[PDB]
Design a protein around this ligand. Structure first.
Ligand SMILES: [Mg+2]
Ligand SMILES: [Mg+2]
Ligand SMILES: [Mg+2]
Ligand SMILES: [Mg+2]
Lengths: 226, 232, 222, 195, 212, 125, 204, 196, 195, 196
């Protein structure tokens, strides 16, 4: 997994690759790692995939109720405080490593959070097995006062470094841009540089190739009238 | 079987159109203690080869002596020792690789990762890796330790495959190497600011640069960073 | 504690035709989650119309190939330049491997060529020297992904003739070199999609009575 | 405990269970009955860790007898086996699991069919024509796979069972001191007193 | 793995399965588990594949040297003991071997020796070795007689491997049959278990538990 | 301390009436009028913002509340009771449905959950 | 010792043109010992199909649990649960046992009754959802299935072509796994008809 | 990590490096280890980042609730709350915290709370992995009642040496000055302190 | 191997040894003779680790036969037992010790006396009226302590031996498949073919 | 143990504490850790006392046999012999040795040989458990071409701090001065160096 977060002029951008693996085997070639905590607070997860998803939805659920209770739009610091206190309580057993980014009435924010409950602030962050490849790109090209277009470019380039150089990362680049005073724009499959080439042969079988012992209709309908 | 005591971090290298570049910092770490600050980890062999070594420094010094002895031995009864029968990068590597694999096979390794950079008699670039396990491989860019994780991605953006090598000048290659060393200084806790860089070119020969420093560093943005979440 | 072994990934595939044999392998070399090289040759022409690959721990792989090549050279010296037949090479490799029975070459070895009747031959070895002549053998990381596909598409396993419904098997008709290369390419393309250690490039060595020919194909680099 | 075998024939279920009880060095008993009647037409044999086997078997017996009194009705073999499976599935994630494997032989009076259920200590249930637990199946299943027919009589089932026991007595290192054999059919449960 | 060998009126039957596994992964279905030591002697493969292959081939070399020096066929007793003495030297080093050395000579008649990597050497009439040995023993014990015909003995060995192949997950692929006579062994073909199972089910009426 | 009222405060009278429920309905009767109308392509709910004082900012008092993105609620009767029911209704939509099925509850089932809460205040101690 | 490979078995699911297919082997074992050749691993609740590989006691327990939950769902909702909703229910149910999980590899397959869209999904033992467009695999021969599916699969296969593809994927994968086989079943699922086919395969 | 707090004439100054490592990888090179628990009560954190953040947040909550009821807490009180958390949960914590604060009555005060959860009031304190290398230097160079400029130089020179020898320390030198005048943040970059 | 018993009566030594050979799960053989004739009037039974037992026994046999040919003379049972003890005492401090326990039953032709020697794998030698190795003594010694007399006939020795085997067959968990019984006296060594 | 060797204008001076501990017990409080391997080639020993004594004795033998054949050995040569023993037997040794010597041609030279058996020529070297606490101090205070009196003060002050913080170091501060003039032994007692 390669995930990055990059601050820019009027907001923040988050990006991720789309490979999920089980050991050396690729389970899903187009996984969605960018998750929504709230409309304008998004995060990307590395580590135990179930934990990253579960902790996002739990805090996202409580954030929504908190937003309704307070009649205020949710803040990134609230998501952050709720995530870290939940994770700290479970002493790293919930293997969620997240980059949290978003905009709120206070402004634009970018945080990382680790499984044991520690958090960090930054203008650029990377997480996952491809984080070193991504951070190499970020440390080479990041500057202060990036534009929206420059930040999207930098973020996706950092993910690409992970895709090509980290075996744990691959396939596509997903991006989400959160700009102040605007709707967050989720860009699913922003880049697609790994389409499989056409195979040399069609493996469609002739009908009747497989040996069959018995056939029967399965009753999926309910108990019928009359 | 042993454990490394005094250690050197990344060695990084790449091919370019007319030769090879190799670089390594001047630190000898003692665990987390940055003990020795004037350690040369690039060792030239003749005027056509530079051997870059990471890992255990005591084993590095042993290898350095083996290479010194190799030059002495090659000159014995050899009228063409400074001409046709001079040591090639390929000879030096194969010798080291033999030693490394033999030593691992006796369960007593030289605890190192080694990159042999040089130019052959016919002008061909030579760049190959060997380590404590006797594992060997070649690539347009090669790096050890942290360099493998952080330098290679950056260097591979310049030379991504074999066909990029003739398109890469010595200025672009050196620039990429120097930037990679800066990135490693930002991110490797066992690195130093001081490093050595060696260029082996088929036209201009061996250029050995000592006492280089990481420069043009970005730190100013640190002033705005406060707390770890909620603190203003 | 010092671990004398490592895993350099890689996947190899040998297929024996009627009057030819292919030995293919990806050119990617790795440790853990890093790529060492996108092109590090793994299948070698050893002379006497024999091709070899020792997949797994690359240091042991290179050592074995080097010693076998050496054995071919000395076989020529000791036996009046006699050609080393594929069966004799296979038995010789068994002894090279079993010589280190208690400190094994951590590799899965495959050799390919032609037997003394000119028919395609592939031999497969375990790390300590147990070997067999086989028609079809994948080795290494993605072997479990490739072999079932080869059982189905080379040997026509579980395939029956339409209309008979399991009574008549699909007949085992001989495959051309072009047909085998298609199955090799599709095997590695599929393996590249689902296995992280497979990719970058595919190099195929084809052995016939005319000699050894090479073919290279790009694989996905992610 | 050691060997427990089961075979479902045409009109009955036959359970064979070893008589030996060994505590380490010595064989303490050679007439132990490793079974409990759960209901008039349902019998359960058992093998596993000492103490837990009988404790589990009697606990099940007590519960099925309670159900029988409350409803004035005998549960089907299937219903009993499902109840037993749940208890074992519950047990495997407990503080200290019941280390007990069981066979449930019953005659369903509604369907007029014999039924044999094999359940291990994890709560792994399967309905079988013949079954076993431990190493018993390793020696006996090749014989059962060969000779078994679904239309066998009770007498033929007993003869096939004798062949299985003979093979066990030949190739098994442990002396299990023979087996007690019981038959479950429409008339209930009875013991074969000469085997 | 399932390998067996038994003595009878017409000599020795040797039957083996063909499956090799690495964990749950089926590495091969076409393994040769009978080692043809020479035209008169057979050995079976169980435990370590290399150990069996290597040392029983080596045994063939020793047997050949014996008959060159002594101008006489080596006895099964002498051949088996060369192997058992060899593996006994290596005891503790980690060799893995469970094999039946099978032969038929003038002085001995049909003879089988179970040889094993902890140094065991046992002469016997029926042996079964491997993960599926218990299944094959059941069929063997209940159907074995000394006065079996060569045809019925061959089938019994085939049927016993099939029993093991069906029940034991690590046995299967195909069945290899051999008949050892005084004038040498005779190969009786490779028999795919998949095809054999259905054939035997129908013709014999066995495996009623399995739907076909 | 401890809540020592563990007994029902709503009970059946001789005539079969549950007094406290009837009296609660009387309180609803005194409340400001609210209504709901269902159309083919929508539903409307409305009420009067009876401002207690002209100095009060009646926009800060929400009589019509979002429960889920597709469900809204209005009331008549005691405002504070409504406010806490809205808090409970919003939460139960998550805890007993969205955290299980990954989607918001259908109207009838959320109503069923709110109804259950109100029923329990009629029987609990 | 490893709970996910004691009993063995496999499940595979595939999408086609206006159809889905889900298939499984029939083996239940105790490591090397084959115990049952009639242990079906696919279940259905209304029109939603669930395959479950792994520890057999948990397979049975989870089937009973989801029957329990989908029956209550139906009584309250007054409609049958959909594949998308059921997938979330499986995920939620597995994750609630985060630190004492069911050792299983579930696979959901079905067609949404309102949109008509084919749907498949897979899970790890603690509920992480894999919602693939093409295919989902699970069990002790998952590597083999990944290999077969990756090469044999193509999109928009007709029901009777999809049957052949998924059958050959299962069969040949199973024949390279010691702990899988002993029979196989394939479900071909269309919007308002489902066909179930038992396959003939080698019994070793 | 290299952290220190030094009392001087006008109050107290906290100092810290900015390096946070995961093994040999620098996970954050611009970390802020100087943490505010009250207006003029701050702390330097060493050990588990998760633990010390958790502790600091709880302390900040306690002192906020203290202030609402009883007015501004003393530095001693803040140290006591830190100690209570560190001592009572010593089995499950890896935290080495220095507490520094300014009162008007007490002026600048420094308390160090090592691993066990003991409290030690000191004129100055050093902690973290890098502190080992500057025990000699700091002991030789510290004086009581230094000026602001002298104390800044003392901390700058001290942490420079700690950074020079400790691989786990590095980046920028952050400082927070606590006096009657208020709260001042200072930052010093590598090009400045490396040439000292 | 498992049970080896020895009893020295008036005019002979009787050795009883189990016939079973078990390799883990299966009983591979039920007619194994766990003994070697060292000389015409000296017999050695043995039990211990697989392979080592026979290897050791045959090595001893070869050495005693060599001595017999060289000197044209049969060593006394005492002399043979001392030679065997030294070999085992030498073995216990070797790189890989012989894990073999033996009984040596011999008839001394010079003294006209039967003699039974018990030696374990450590080289612990004792001359006894009756002896055993492993767990065999735990079941049998109480019977031997009660019934044994030094003036017993060979037939009485065999009857007492039968009682010992019966007690073993009753209380031992393992099926050792009966025993082969051999008698050593002035006329040499012979096997009792019905026991 | 706290040991150091410092080159200066007229040659080199070796310095050491005198404490030898077995756990927390001081087995010898007046140990001589400054060991003579040749007339003007000495060494400071740290690590296993058995190992470093064994090594020093072997080196002394080698240099004695060297001298009989080839005349006075260089300090580099002595360091090489030390290194050969430490490197080749690294698996079975726990020795950290500083070699210091005076030639007339080369003047004062210092070589440090840490645990692995590597060699490092330095202007000055520090080693032993107590050296950790004075890396900062020594780096700040060392100058090249100091006078004899300055070098004695530098070593005295340095080892004083090492002794102050390291429980494994203590006792007297021994010193050996190596110059053209000859070999001078110095000793400094606790009452002197503790008040520095
Ligand atoms: Mg790949
Ligand atoms: Mg099988
Ligand atoms: Mg299978
Ligand atoms: Mg540093």
């Amino acid at each position: 997994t390669t995930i990055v977060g990059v601050k820019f002029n009027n907001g923040v951008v988050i990006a991720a690759d789309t490979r999920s693996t089980q050991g050396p085997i690729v389970a899903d070639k187009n996984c969605a790692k960018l998750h929504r905590i709230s409309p304008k607070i998004w995060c990307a997860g590395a580590g135990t995939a179930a934990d990253t998803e579960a902790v996002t939805q739990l805090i996202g659920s409580n954030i929504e109720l908190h937003s309704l209770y307070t009649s205020r739009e949710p803040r990134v610091v609230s998501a952050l405080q709720m995530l870290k206190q939940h994770l700290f309580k479970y002493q790293g057993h919930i293997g969620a490593y997240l980059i949290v980014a978003g905009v709120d009435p206070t402004g634009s924010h970018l945080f990382s959070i680790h499984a044991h409950g520690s958090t960090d602030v930054g203008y650029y962050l990377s997480l996952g097995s491809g984080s070193l490849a991504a951070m190499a790109v970020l440390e080479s090209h990041w500057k202060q006062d990036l534009t929206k277009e420059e930040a999207i470019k930098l973020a996706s380039d950092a993910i690409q470094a992970g895709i090509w150089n980290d075996l744990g990362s691959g396939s596509n680049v997903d991006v989400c841009v959160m700009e102040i005073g605007k709707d967050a724009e989720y860009l699913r499959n922003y880049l697609t540089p790994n389409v499989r080439e056409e195979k040399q042969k069609s493996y469609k079988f002739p009908r009747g190739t497989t040996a069959v012992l018995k056939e029967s209709i399965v009753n999926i309908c309910d108990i019928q009238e009359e | 079987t042993q454990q490394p005591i005094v250690t050197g971090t990344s060695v990084i290298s790449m091919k370019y159109d007319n030769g090879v570049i190799i670089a390594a910092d001047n630190l000898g770490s003692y665990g987390s203690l940055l003990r020795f600050n004037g350690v040369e980890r690039l060792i030239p062999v003749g005027d056509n080869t530079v051997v870059g070594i990471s890992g255990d420094i005591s084993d590095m010094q042993h290898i350095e002596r083996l290479l010194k002895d190799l030059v002495t031995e090659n000159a014995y009864d050899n009228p063409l020792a400074d001409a046709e029968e001079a040591l090639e990068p390929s000879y030096i590597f194969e010798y080291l690789a033999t030693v490394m694999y033999q030593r691992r096979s006796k369960m007593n390794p030289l605890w190192n990762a080694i990159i042999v950079a040089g130019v052959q008699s016919n002008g061909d670039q030579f760049l190959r890796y060997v380590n404590l396990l006797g594992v060997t491989y070649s690539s347009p860019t090669l790096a050890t330790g942290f360099g493998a994780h952080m330098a290679n991605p950056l260097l591979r953006k310049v030379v991504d495959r074999e066909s990029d090598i003739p398109k890469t000048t010595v200025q672009v290659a050196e620039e990429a190497i120097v930037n990679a060393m800066r990135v490693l200084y930002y991110r490797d806790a066992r690195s130093s600011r001081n490093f050595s860089l060696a260029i082996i070119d088929k036209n201009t020969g061996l250029t050995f640069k000592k006492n280089l420093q990481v420069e043009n560093m970005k730190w100013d943005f640190a002033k705005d960073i406060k707390g770890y979440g909620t603190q203003k | 504690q010092f671990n004398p072994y490592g895993d350099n990934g890689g996947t190899i595939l040998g297929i024996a035709g009627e009057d030819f044999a292919v030995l293919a392998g990806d050119t990617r070399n790795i440790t853990d989650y890093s790529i060492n090289s996108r092109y590090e040759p793994k299948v070698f022409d050893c002379g006497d119309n024999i091709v070899m690959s020792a997949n797994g721990f690359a240091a042991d792989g290179d050592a074995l190939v080097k010693r076998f090549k050496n054995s071919v050279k000395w076989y020529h010296f000791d036996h009046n330049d006699k050609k080393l037949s594929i069966n004799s090479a296979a038995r010789n490799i068994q002894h090279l491997l079993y010589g280190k029975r208690f400190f094994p070459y951590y590799v899965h070895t495959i050799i390919a060529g032609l037997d003394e009747d000119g028919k395609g031959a592939v031999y497969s070895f375990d790390p300590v020297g147990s070997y067999e002549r086989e028609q079809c053998r994948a080795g290494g990381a993605a072997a479990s992904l490739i072999m079932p596909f080869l059982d189905n598409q080379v040997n026509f396993k579980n395939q029956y003739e339409p209309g008979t419904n399991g009574k008549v098997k699909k007949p085992l008709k001989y495959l051309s070199v072009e047909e085998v290369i298609k199955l090799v390419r599709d095997s590695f393309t599929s393996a590249t999609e689902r296995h992280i250690q497979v990719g970058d490039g595919l190099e195929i060595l084809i052995v016939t009575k005319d000699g050894v020919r090479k073919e290279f194909y790009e694989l996905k680099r992610d | 405990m050691d060997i427990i075998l089961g075979i479902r024939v045409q009109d009955s279920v036959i359970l064979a269970s070893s008589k030996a009880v060994t505590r380490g060095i010595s064989v303490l008993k050679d007439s132990d009955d490793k079974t409990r009647q759960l209901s008039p037409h349902t019998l359960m044999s058992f093998a596993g860790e000492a103490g837990d086997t009988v404790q589990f078997a009697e606990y099940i017996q007590a519960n099925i007898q309670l159900y029988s009194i409350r409803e004035d009705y005998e549960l089907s073999p299937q219903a009993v086996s499902s109840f037993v499976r749940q208890e074992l599935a519950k047990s495997i994630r407990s503080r200290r699991p019941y280390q007990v494997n069981v066979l449930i032989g019953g005659y369903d009076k509604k369907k007029n069919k014999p039924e044999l259920y094999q359940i291990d200590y994890l709560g792994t249930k399967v309905e079988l024509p013949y079954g076993a637990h431990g190493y018993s199946g390793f020696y006996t299943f090749s014989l059962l796979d060969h000779h078994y027919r679904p239309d066998m009589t009770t007498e033929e089932g007993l003869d096939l069972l004798k062949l299985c026991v003979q093979e066990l007595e030949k190739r098994m290192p442990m002396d299990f001191k023979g087996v007690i054999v019981k038959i479950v059919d429409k008339d209930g449960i009875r013991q074969v007193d000469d085997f | 793995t399932t390998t067996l060998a038994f003595r009878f009126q017409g000599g020795i039957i040797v039957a083996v399965d063909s499956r090799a596994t690495a964990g749950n992964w089926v590495a091969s279905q076409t393994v040769k588990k009978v080692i043809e030591i020479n035209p008169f002697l057979l050995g079976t493969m169980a435990g370590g594949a290399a150990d069996c292959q290597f040392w029983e081939t080596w045994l063939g070399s020793q047997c050949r040297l014996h008959e060159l020096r002594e101008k006489e066929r080596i006895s099964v007793a002498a051949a088996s003991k060369i192997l058992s003495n060899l593996v006994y030297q290596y005891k503790g080093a980690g060799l893995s071997m469970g094999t039946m050395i099978c032969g038929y000579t003038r002085k001995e008649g049909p003879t089988i020796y179970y040889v094993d990597s902890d140094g065991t050497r046992l002469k016997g009439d029926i042996f079964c070795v491997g993960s599926g040995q218990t299944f094959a023993y059941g069929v063997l014990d209940s159907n074995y007689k000394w006065d079996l015909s060569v045809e019925d003995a061959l089938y019994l060995g085939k049927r016993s491997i099939l029993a093991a192949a069906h029940r034991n997950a690590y046995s299967g692929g195909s069945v290899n049959l051999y008949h050892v006579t005084e004038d040498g062994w005779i190969y009786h073909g490779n028999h795919d278990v998949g095809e054999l199972f259905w054939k035997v089910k129908e013709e014999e009426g066995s495996f009623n538990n399995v739907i076909g | 301390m401890t809540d020592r009222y563990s007994f029902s405060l709503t009970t059946f009278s001789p005539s079969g009436k549950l007094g406290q429920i009837d009296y609660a309905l009387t309180a609803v009767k005194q409340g400001v009028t609210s209504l709901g109308i269902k159309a083919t392509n929508g539903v409307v709910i409305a009420t009067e913002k009876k401002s207690s004082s002209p100095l009060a900012m009646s926009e800060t008092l929400s009589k019509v509340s979002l429960l889920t993105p597709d469900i809204g609620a209005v009331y008549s009767g005691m405002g504070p009771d409504y406010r806490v029911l809205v808090d409970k209704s919003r939460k139960v939509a998550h805890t007993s449905y969205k955290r299980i099925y990954g989607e918001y509850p259908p109207t009838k089932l959320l109503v069923s959950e709110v109804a259950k809460i109100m029923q329990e205040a009629t029987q609990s101690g | 010792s490893d709970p996910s490979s004691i009993n063995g078995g496999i499940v595979v699911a595939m999408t086609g043109k206006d159809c889905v297919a889900i298939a499984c082997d029939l083996r239940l074992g105790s490591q090397s010992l084959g115990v049952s050749n009639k242990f079906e691993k696919i279940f259905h609740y209304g029109h939603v199909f669930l395959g479950i590989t792994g520890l057999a006691t948990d397979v049975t327990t989870l089937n009973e649990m989801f029957r329990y939950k989908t029956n209550l769902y139906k009584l309250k909702e007054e409609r049958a649960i959909e594949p998308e909703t059921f997938t979330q229910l499986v995920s939620s149910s597995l994750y609630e046992r985060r630190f004492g999980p069911y050792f299983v590899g579930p696979v959901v397959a079905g067609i949404n009754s309102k949109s008509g869209k084919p749907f498949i999904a897979g899970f790890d033992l603690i509920g992480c959802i894999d919602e693939a467009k093409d295919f989902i695999v699970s069990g002790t021969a998952s590597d083999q299935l990944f290999g077969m599916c990756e090469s044999l699969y193509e999109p928009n296969l007709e029901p009777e072509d999809l049957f052949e593809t998924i059958s050959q994927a299962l069969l040949n994968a199973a024949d390279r796994d010691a702990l899988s086989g002993w029979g196989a079943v394939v479900y071909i699922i269309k919007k308002d008809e489902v066909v179930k086919r038992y396959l003939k395969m080698r019994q070793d | 990590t290299s952290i220190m707090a030094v009392t001087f004439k006008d109050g107290v100054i906290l100092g810290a490096d900015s390096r946070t490592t995961t093994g040999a990888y620098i996970a954050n090179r611009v970390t802020d280890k100087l943490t505010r628990v009250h207006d003029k009560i701050w702390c330097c954190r060493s050990g588990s980042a998760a633990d010390t953040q958790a502790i600091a947040d709880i302390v900040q909550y306690h002192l906020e609730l203290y202030t609402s009821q009883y007015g501004t807490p003393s530095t001693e009180t803040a140290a006591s709350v830190f100690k209570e958390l560190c001592y009572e949960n010593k089995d499950n914590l890896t935290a080495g915290i220095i507490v520094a604060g300014y009162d008007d009555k007490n002026k600048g005060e420094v308390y160090t709370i090592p691993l066990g959860g003991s409290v030690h009031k000191l004129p100055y304190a050093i902690a973290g992995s890098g502190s080992t290398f500057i025990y000699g230097y700091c002991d030789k160079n510290f004086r009581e009642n230094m000026s602001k400029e002298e104390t800044v130089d003392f901390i700058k020179h001290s942490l420079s040496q700690a950074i020079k020898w400790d691989g786990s320390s590095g980046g920028v030198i952050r400082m927070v000055v606590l006096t009657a005048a208020g709260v001042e943040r200072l930052i010093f970059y590598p090009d400045e302190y490396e040439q000292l």
